[PDB]
Amino acid sequence: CPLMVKVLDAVRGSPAINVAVHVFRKAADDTWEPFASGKTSESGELHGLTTEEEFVEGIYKVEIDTKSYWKALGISPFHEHAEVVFTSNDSGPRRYTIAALLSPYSYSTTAVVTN
Amino acid sequence: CPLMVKVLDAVRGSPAINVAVHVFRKAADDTWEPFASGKTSESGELHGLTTEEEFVEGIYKVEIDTKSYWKALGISPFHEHAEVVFTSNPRRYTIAALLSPYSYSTTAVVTN
Ligand SMILES: O=C(O)c1ccc2nc(-c3cc(Cl)cc(Cl)c3)oc2c1
Ligand SMILES: O=C(O)c1ccc2nc(-c3cc(Cl)cc(Cl)c3)oc2c1
């Protein structure tokens, strides 16, 4: 599992469950092309997005549909979504965890890169 | 000043100076049209991006060039940039971002 997503809810103090997540990769013509997607689990995690073979060096965007999440809880949000854009790097063995902490008018994201 | 951007550096404990910021607005054909741009000042603030007349309802993207910022400081960061995407309808927006090499936070302060 080279790429995992974990989403947390800062209002409810809980995993952010059933959040849609879309991953894109930048294509040669500089557009975003769909790559993988899913919904977070009961633990706020999304595994199995891609494989080591498919996850080649490139520019990737992880789009977290925060607005639908807050609307489902009845809370007025600011952002359309949370976007995390990064270049993957094959400098030795690496696994990427993209973590996001959500509030209605704020979000934080960090990358946990491990070998 | 209906749209202001403030950027802070969580490593040095300072405003993030000379950070490029690009604002885009979604057009009718669903593409991102350039809307305004600038650089943060010595206080980490970017004022005068737009006007009340120009800042109409729409979907806006604020792209903060964090990668160039870190690389000018000799750090290889994780993210290409920090992106804040929001719908406007709520008349003065402050978009604040706090930056680390492998992480950032953003918040919106919306006042009348
Ligand atoms: O990958 C995990 O298992 C795992 C666990 C707890 C975690 N808490 C964070 C977290 C906390 C704050 Cl305050 C802000 C942000 Cl962006 C992230 O990320 C986690 C990841
Ligand atoms: O001193 C000011 O004027 C001023 C303005 C905007 C500011 N935004 C922050 C801020 C943002 C995030 Cl995402 C997380 C944290 Cl801890 C802080 O601090 C600010 C300070």
Author numbering:
A (entry chain B): 10 to 124
B (entry chain A): 10 to 98, 102 to 124
What do the study's own words say?
Hereditary transthyretin (TTR) amyloidosis (ATTRv), caused by mutations in the TTR gene, is a systemic disease characterized by extracellular amyloid deposition caused by misfolding of the TTR protein throughout the body. 15 Both drugs can successfully complex to the thyroxine binding site and kinetically stabilize TTR tetramers, inhibiting the release of the TTR monomer required for amyloidogenesis. Patients with the A97S mutation, the major cause of ATTRv in Taiwan and East Asia, usually manifest with late‐onset polyneuropathy and cardiomyopathy 4 and have rarely been included in these studies.
Although the complex structures of tafamidis and TTR variants (V30M, D38A, S52P, L55P and V122I) were previously determined, 17 previous studies did not include the A97S‐TTR/tafamidis complex. Here, we characterized the cocrystal structure of tafamidis and A97S‐TTR at a resolution of 1.69 Å. This high‐resolution crystal structure provided a clear and unambiguous depiction of the position of tafamidis within the electron density map of the TTR dimer–dimer interface. Notably, the presence of a twofold symmetry axis along the T4‐binding pocket results in two distinct binding modes of tafamidis, each related by a 180° rotation. Compared to those in the published A97S‐TTR/diflunisal complex, the chlorine atoms in the 3,5‐dichloro ring of tafamidis facilitate intersubunit bridging primarily through hydrophobic interactions between HBP3 and 3′, while its carboxylate group is indirectly connected to the ε‐amino group of K15 or K15′ through water molecules. In both cases, the resonance peaks that significantly shifted as a result of drug binding were mainly located at the dimer–dimer interface, which was previously reported as the thyroxine‐binding site. Our structural investigations have shown that both diflunisal and tafamidis effectively bind to the two T4 binding sites located at the TTR dimer‐dimer interface, resulting in the stabilization of tetrameric A97S‐TTR. We also evaluated whether tafamidis and diflunisal inhibited the amyloidogenicity of A97S in vitro, revealing that both compounds equally and almost sufficiently reduced fibril formation. In the present study, we first demonstrated the structural biology of the A97S‐TTR/tafamidis complex and compared it with that of the A97S‐TTR/diflunisal complex. Both diflunisal and tafamidis can effectively stabilize tetrameric A97S‐TTR and inhibit its acid‐mediated aggregation.
